């Protein structure tokens, strides 16, 4: 009883921000009751760390026989270096699923 159903990002596609706008990327992952989940992100920039943007707390929900694990990624202000491909990998030890998404930050006033 240690399996993962699917990992989805919200929003999933077509995220578009201006320079200096707050970026938000949640990462839901449905799993079984006994399953533990570990979130590791992958961002294109080299300015931020994994200790800033990724959530320190957790967000879990229980429903009948399915558990939800949620991890958020908050960036206070964005730049051209942040533009690229974001990926949220949710590893349980015995399994690891990942989903991709593209974000665009244009040079324009917010």
């Amino acid at each position, epitope marked *: 009883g240690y399996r993962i159903y699917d990992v989805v990002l919200s929003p999933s596609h077509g995220i578009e921000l201006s320079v200096g706008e707050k970026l938000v990327l949640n990462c839901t992952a449905r799993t079984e009751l006994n399953v533990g989940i*570990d979130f590791n992100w992958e961002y294109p920039s080299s300015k931020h760390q994994h200790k800033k943007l990724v959530n320190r707390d957790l967000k879990t929900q229980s429903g009948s026989e399915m558990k939800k694990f949620l991890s958020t990624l908050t960036i206070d202000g964005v730049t051209r270096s942040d533009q690229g491909l974001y990926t949220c990998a949710a590893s349980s030890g015995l399994m690891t699923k990942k989903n991709s998404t593209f974000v665009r930050v244009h040079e324009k006033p917010f």
Partner: antibody
Amino acid sequence: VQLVQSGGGLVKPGGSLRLSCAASGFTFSSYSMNWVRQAPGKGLEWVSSISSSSSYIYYADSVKGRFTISRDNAKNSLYLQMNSLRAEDTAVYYCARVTDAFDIWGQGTMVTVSS
Amino acid sequence: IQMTQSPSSVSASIGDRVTITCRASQGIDNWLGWYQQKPGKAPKLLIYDASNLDTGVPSRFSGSGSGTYFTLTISSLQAEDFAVYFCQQAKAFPPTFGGGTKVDIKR
């Protein structure tokens, strides 16, 4: 995409040696890594697993309370310290990437525990 | 959770339709993997989640089945395909492997 192994060799019952597995070709930080062994002639046996940030660790009943799994994500390498070895631990040990199935396997390294 | 492969050995020639069976003790829905191992070197994933082929693997390999019964078919056997084949379950806590099925040269 590669997975090079090293560190294995000869040990006497009770002794211990480090077992390295260096990744290159993909983002190491992200996937869960497992250890699977194969005794000479015998089939495959899952030994241990570990999450991407070393949060969740699991061991088989054959290796629980003796083997210790670990990883350094900065170095992009997987480790496995093997303490209190028995004669039935002599096998070919494989590190492997996990994603649905064990899609990427290391070349393999044989450890020998005999007296 | 036990995985039993049938048969233990299969005699085949080049171009044959070889089928390998893998049976579980309890239901695994669709979480079955297939691996190929040749003597001396490490195993390589052929198929995952029962039917889905891995990248790089030729289309002659195919997988089917669900629950307890599963099957790995090779549509047209080639000289590279002579090797041992293991099935592996991903439902219960400990992922167990099958005993293995050797596909060797008919004689």
